[PDB]
Design a protein around this ligand. Structure first.
Ligand SMILES: Cc1ccc(-n2nc(C(C)(C)C)cc2NC(=O)Nc2cccc(Nc3ccnc4ccc(N)cc34)c2)cc1
Ligand SMILES: CCCCCCCCO[C@@H]1O[C@H](CO)[C@@H](O)[C@H](O)[C@H]1O
Ligand SMILES: CCCCCCCCO[C@@H]1O[C@H](CO)[C@@H](O)[C@H](O)[C@H]1O
Length: 339
């Protein structure tokens, strides 16, 4: 059963992997892990192999390692990264200290595409349809991505898109919902839709919607488009500290998106309006967006599946590193590759 491994140092790092993975070359690195591209001799596909750094060196790292394995083991959707393989050199729980994660290699990402060419509307539809299809699925398992941005969207020569998390340690803040920027301590799925909002806009116009140089600037850039909060929303913020200091900022009206996104498809503009509402309660959800008329060429409610129940209870446990490691060991041990 157990495969035979080989060994090589790549950059500063030891990479011990089953023979089937060949032609290893580094594609990026940092505090959360390193990745190599590689050829999977078993399938004939290019794959990405992620070695987690110091997976069990702290509690937080331990919980992070478990979190990522569990999440990735559960994801089974065309528009979301999937696990091809997870493996460890270790022969048992006691030797156990290294975790490798394997997925399809992604060609490249959506950020490249944006710069190197401008985009047709049919293309924009295709790209955004796929992101929301993926997000419907992720949101159905009560997972929030939280860091949707063009560099976490991998797209192939065929325009097939997968959502992932390229991060291994073009500001994230450019796509971040106004409430995250405010350290609102209980934010929800709609943060994701804000981000899709920022991406679509960018895909249509060619440039960053809100290219803020810091958190304060970011809110200024936003409020110039969506306008200062109104009373029905100020009523939702019962902090007197807040309300009175926002009202002391010179008012800013809501722009009409129709006068902003010039020469774009009316339907794109309407959808955007539904996504970039300041009040997260009023934003369109992923499920609802897939049905909007902008995606009539693509929509099919019989092919927009939801995720199987996903047990998240571990998130609210406070455990020992060896326990998180043991649990991660079980999940390695029980992995069944997809056909
Ligand atoms: C602590 C933690 C928890 C979860 C994650 N997530 N979350 C997700 C969602 C399902 C929510 C999109 C995905 C991840 N992790 C994830 O994508 N990990 C991962 C695993 C293996 C390889 C890669 N990176 C690459 C994948 C594909 N092609 C690449 C090409 C070049 C390159 N440098 C990296 C990759 C990312 C990441 C970290
Ligand atoms: C170009 C390099 C050729 C490498 C081919 C890798 C084939 C690995 O061989 C495989 O793995 C296991 C041991 O690793 C064996 O038990 C199996 O026979 C086989 O499934
Ligand atoms: C700088 C002015 C503040 C603009 C921030 C917009 C407020 C975000 O919107 C808020 O998101 C909260 C988080 O879940 C929800 O509890 C509220 O229902 C929603 O109104």
């Amino acid at each position: 059963e157990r495969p035979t491994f080989y060994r090589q140092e790549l950059n500063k790092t030891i990479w011990e992997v089953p023979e089937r993975y060949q032609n290893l070359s580094p594609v990026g690195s940092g505090a959360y892990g390193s990745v190599c591209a590689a050829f999977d001799t078993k399938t004939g596909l290019r794959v990405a192999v992620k070695k987690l750094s110091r997976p069990f060196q702290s509690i937080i790292h331990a919980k992070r390692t478990y979190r990522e394995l569990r999440l990735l083991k559960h994801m089974k959707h065309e528009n979301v990264i999937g696990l091809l393989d997870v493996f460890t050199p270790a022969r048992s729980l006691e030797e156990f200290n290294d975790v490798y994660l394997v997925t399809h290699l992604m060609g490249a990402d959506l950020n490249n595409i944006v710069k190197c060419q401008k985009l047709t509307d049919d293309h924009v539809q295709f790209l955004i349809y796929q992101i929301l299809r993926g997000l419907k699925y992720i949101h159905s398992a009560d997972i929030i991505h939280r860091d949707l941005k063009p560099s976490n969207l991998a797209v192939n020569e065929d325009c097939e898109l997968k959502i992932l998390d390229f991060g291994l340690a073009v500001a994230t803040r450019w796509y971040r919902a106004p409430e995250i920027m405010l350290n609102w301590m209980h934010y929800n799925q709609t943060v994701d839709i804000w981000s899709v909002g920022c991406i679509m806009a960018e895909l249509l116009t060619g440039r960053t919607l809100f290219p803020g140089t810091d958190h304060i600037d970011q809110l200024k850039l936003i409020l110039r488009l969506v306008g200062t909060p109104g009373a029905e929303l100020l009523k939702k913020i019962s902090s007197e500290s807040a309300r009175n200091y926002i009202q002391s900022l010179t008012q800013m009206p809501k722009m009409n998106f129709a006068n902003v996104f010039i020469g774009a498809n009316p339907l794109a503009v309407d959808l955007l309006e539904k996504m970039l509402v300041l009040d997260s309660d009023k934003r369109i959800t992923a499920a609802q967006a897939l049905a909007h008329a902008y995606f009539a060429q693509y929509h099919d409610p019989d092919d927009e599946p939801v995720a199987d129940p996903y047990d998240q209870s571990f998130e609210s446990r406070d455990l020992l590193i060896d326990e998180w490691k043991s649990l991660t060991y079980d999940e390695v041990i029980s992995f069944v590759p997809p056909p």
